[PDB]
Amino acid sequence: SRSAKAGLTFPVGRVHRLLRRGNYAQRIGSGAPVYLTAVLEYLAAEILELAGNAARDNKKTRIIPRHLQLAIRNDDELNKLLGNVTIAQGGVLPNIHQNLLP
Amino acid sequence: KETYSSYIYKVLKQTHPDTGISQKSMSILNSFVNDIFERIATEASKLAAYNKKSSAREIQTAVRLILPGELAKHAVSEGTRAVTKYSS
Amino acid sequence: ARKSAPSTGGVKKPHRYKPGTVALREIRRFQKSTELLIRKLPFQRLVREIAQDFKTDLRFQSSAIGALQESVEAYLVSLFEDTNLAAIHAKRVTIMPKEIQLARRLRGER
Amino acid sequence: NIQGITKPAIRRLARRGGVKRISGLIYEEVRAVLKSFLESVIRDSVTYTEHAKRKTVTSLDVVYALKRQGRTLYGF
Amino acid sequence: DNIQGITKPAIRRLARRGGVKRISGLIYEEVRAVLKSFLESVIRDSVTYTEHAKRKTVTSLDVVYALKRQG
Amino acid sequence: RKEKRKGWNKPDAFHVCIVSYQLVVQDQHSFKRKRWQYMVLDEAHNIKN
Amino acid sequence: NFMSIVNCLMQLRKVCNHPNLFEVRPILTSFVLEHCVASDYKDVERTLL
Amino acid sequence: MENTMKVYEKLSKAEKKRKIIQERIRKHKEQESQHMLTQEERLRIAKETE
DNA sequence: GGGAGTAATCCCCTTGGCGGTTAAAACGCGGGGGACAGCGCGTACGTGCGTTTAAGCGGTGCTAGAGCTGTCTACGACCAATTGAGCGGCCTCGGCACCGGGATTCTCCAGGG
DNA sequence: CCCTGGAGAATCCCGGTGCCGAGGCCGCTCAATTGGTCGTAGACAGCTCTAGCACCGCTTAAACGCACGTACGCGCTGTCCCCCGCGTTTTAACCGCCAAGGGGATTACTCCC
């Protein structure tokens, strides 16, 4: 199919069909059907690595959504590029002030 | 009903194959995929609106416009790899 | 002992705990909590009691009420953090409406 | 219903919010503002329930209202 | 490395015309730092727009688009 | 209940635990963890469906 | 009033109660109307005097 | 990410040490006392309970 | 001889209070952290200073990226069509769920020195 | 007073039992790129264009320091309000109880083949 020809894991034929149905502009270059798919796989792969190490931190083989929140909230860049989304099963990272605790 | 469940499982096995999943995480990752895609496409279209236009370069420059350079360099490299593989 | 019991009662004893340490332990235990806290059934009761004003026969779904609960519950917590930081910025470790109004007028209510 | 979020519920929400001491004249205004927010979101939800005059409200409607309200939410 | 060459008496006069009865050097330094950070955070999108404008000279359309994106 | 169960796991501190018909419904997690040699369901008309 | 699973429940309440629970005889008292005829007539007489 | 990996590794080593020490404690306590089934002092404990 | 609404059966499925509970919400207060009022201080800006000074002000000679045109070719829309990525019941077994077991240290009370 | 014992116990991690969960297996099933053309539009030269670069150099008005000098955030103090935790009390859903309809159909009846 399209994945073997492109040599990429995430399907791009369906993604390119969705982009064509989008019709965002008159000139839609079809030569890169997997560019957005490539960037999303890279982002999701680094997110998955962060979530995996977070889950292995607390002897949790299965990724609890709290681990996902911790993974997406422990990095300055990740919170900078999006910080206005409230994920299900919340809970901010632990914090304390120099005045509340001795 | 073409979802990304198979692709998500593939990327799971690629990154952390030993790690399992929940029953609602896949919805979160699918939302990440498609919402990032549509917002990036909308920014690309609004950028191309001014210039007369009636591909890889547009997507790459849209990525470099707003998305951080730390990720933008990797995005450009992987996009070049993908387009070369497609042309191969 | 109120009545027949395991021998002699009153084993509870005067064991009052002073605040501060109790407050610290309860906030520490509450922070790790990640699920819903307020009762959902009164929430749906009130949201249906405040929906017929627009129109009746609107009907609802579990996904809907769940999403509104998630939206309201995950938004006021950041407000609480902002109010607490504005409070301990001044010499007021307790919360009063002054710093909450301060937070409202710095977070762009309009 | 005015007393939906009762006093202990608001108290434990505040404790989850990391406050040392919570005074006894603070929950009224917080309740007022959250009721205003709830009225706004339900008004939007009923508006887009009549986008196709659908006779039911679902998660799509409320996520629409919240995503155009500026307070984006995730987990779905 | 001219970024440290911004004249402090400029901030002194700006504070004096802005008011306040106590404007220490810490206030001047912090407002200078935040102004520089904001200038950088807007010029980044300005120069990216110029790069994705097929042009190499700064023009008002670039800053107009930058401020529209930034609000 | 927790105070009673404190001295219940390790030793043979008891043989019969007096439990009502409705207590087991909410406490099933602690009940099923312990294997019981015998149980009796007095007034079997309580459960019929 | 299609439903009738409890339509005999009010009959049972009637039989056992003997309307000393449905409605008991109260301590009768007259009406307590309070508007009064002279509510808006003191001003005129005061001005006249 | 490597800091998280080494933190996880040291957490695993501490968990393994706790496993070893608690398992040794449990094994020592298991073999120290086997007396609940004797059918002789049961009369004494029954009399005390009565 | 043989099949389909009508009569009838199935099997809970409704219906609404209706007893009997165990989880929460709303009480009262001794003290007790928590907020608030007074007084000095000291330092560090507000200013009115004499003194340089650096963008303004006015005009210039072009010039180097910009505004801009054919145009013509690299390239964006193009519909057959087929087997493949994948999407859907299903069905198992251990990661997770929840609670007791006991050492370390967290922490506060009764002393020792 | 610092230090030692002495106990409730958080946390750790392990159990210990119950379950439901990712994905494979069977089924199939919808579209991506080949295969080509229609046109088209965006960069290759060509012309140009237009105010920016930097320059000329006084000239007030920022740079810019300093002594009077006092204003109030904060150091302490006293003065003193009502947050917070132990013991009680009043709602609240939920498991059932009870019994009269629920409803597609096919399998006696009788009308179709």
Looking at residue B76, which CATH number applies to its domain? 1.10.20.10
Q: How far apart are CA A58 and CA A76, in angstroms?
A: 22
What long-range pairs does C91-100 form, CB within 8 A, spacing at least 24? Answer: C93/A99, C93/D20, C93/D21, C94/D20, C94/D21, C94/D22, C94/D23, C95/D14, C95/D19, C95/D21, C95/D22, C95/D23, C95/D26, C96/D23, C96/D25, C96/D26, C97/D25, C97/D26, C97/D29, C100/D26, C100/D29, C100/D30
Task: Please check whether strand I approaches the CB of D1 to within 7 Å.
Answer: no
Contacts of A63 (CB under 8 A, 6+ apart): A51, A52, A54, A55, B19, B20, B21, B22, B25
* Nearest nucleotide from residue H17 CA, by C1' atom: J13
Q: Hey, CA dihedral for A85, A90, A94, A95, is it positive or negative?
A: positive
Pairing of strands C94-95, D21-22: parallel
Start-to-end C-alpha separation, chain B: 31
CA angle H24, H27, H32 (to 5 degrees): 125
Q: How far apart are CA D26 and CA E5, in angstroms?
A: 49
- The region that residue D73 occupies, defined by phi over 0 for left and psi between -120 and 50 for alpha, beta otherwise, is beta
Number of compact structural domains in chain B: 1
Segments in chain C forming alpha helices (H): 21-31, 40-49, 62-73, 76-89, 97-106
The answer to whether E66 and E49 are in contact (CB under 8 A) is: yes
How far from D76 is each of B31, B76, C62, CA to CA, in Å? 7, 29, 14
Q: How far apart are CA H47 and CA D16, in angstroms?
A: 54
Radius of gyration of chain B (CA): 16
Q: Hey, CA dihedral for B18, B23, B25, B26, is it positive or negative?
A: positive
State in words which class domain A1-85 has: mainly alpha
Closest residue in B to A43 (Cα) is B71
Q: How far apart are CA D71 and CA A85, in angstroms?
A: 7
Q: Which of E32, E34, E30, E26 is nearest to E10 (CA)?
A: E32
Way it was determined: cryo-EM
Contacts of B78 (CB under 8 A, 6+ apart): A38, A39, A42
Could you give the maximum distance between any two Cα atoms of chain D, in Å?
48
Q: Which of residues 21-50 of H touch A (CB under 8 A)?
A: none
The answer to whether C70 and D75 are in contact (CB under 8 A) is: yes
In Å, what is the separation between the CA of E18 and the C1' of J65?
22
In one-letter notation, the amino acid at residue C41 is: L
Domains in chain D with CATH codes: 1-76 (1.10.20.10)
Task: Please check whether strand J approaches the CB of D16 to within 7 Å.
Answer: no
Q: How far apart are CA B42 and CA F18, in angstroms?
A: 68
Per-residue three-class SS string for G8-24? CHHHHHHHHHCCCCCCC
Place of tokens 């309201």: C72
How is residue D21 annotated by DSSP? E
Place of tokens 């299900």: A88
**CA nearest to nucleotide J17 C1': residue:** F33
A59 interaction partners in chain H (CB closer than 8 Å): 15
Of A90, A100, A101, the CB nearest to C34: A90
Q: How far apart are CA H19 and CA H14, in angstroms?
A: 9
Q: How far apart are CA C39 and CA C35, in angstroms?
A: 12
How far from E19 is each of A68, E11, E16, E29, E71, CA to CA, in Å? 48, 12, 5, 17, 28
- Label residue D65 exposed, middle or buried (CB < 10 Å: 0-12, 13-18, 19+): buried
Closest residue in B to E48 (Cα) is B65
Q: Which two three-digit tokens encode residue C28?
A: 């520490």
Residue B6's domain comprises: 1-88
How is residue F8 annotated by DSSP? T
Q: How far apart are CA G2 and CA C36, in angstroms?
A: 41
CA angle D49, A86, D55 (to 5 degrees): 10
| Cβ neighbours, 10 Å, residue G8 | 11
In Å, what is the separation between the CA of E30 and the C1' of I75?
53
Q: How many CA atoms lie within 13 A of A64 on its CB side?
A: 16
Q: Which of A44, H12, F30, C75 is nearest to D66 (CA)?
A: C75
**Nearest 5°: phi and psi at C95?**
-100, 135
How far from E45 is each of A36, B52, E54, E62, CA to CA, in Å? 21, 21, 15, 9
- Which run of H or E residues covers position F28? helix F28-32
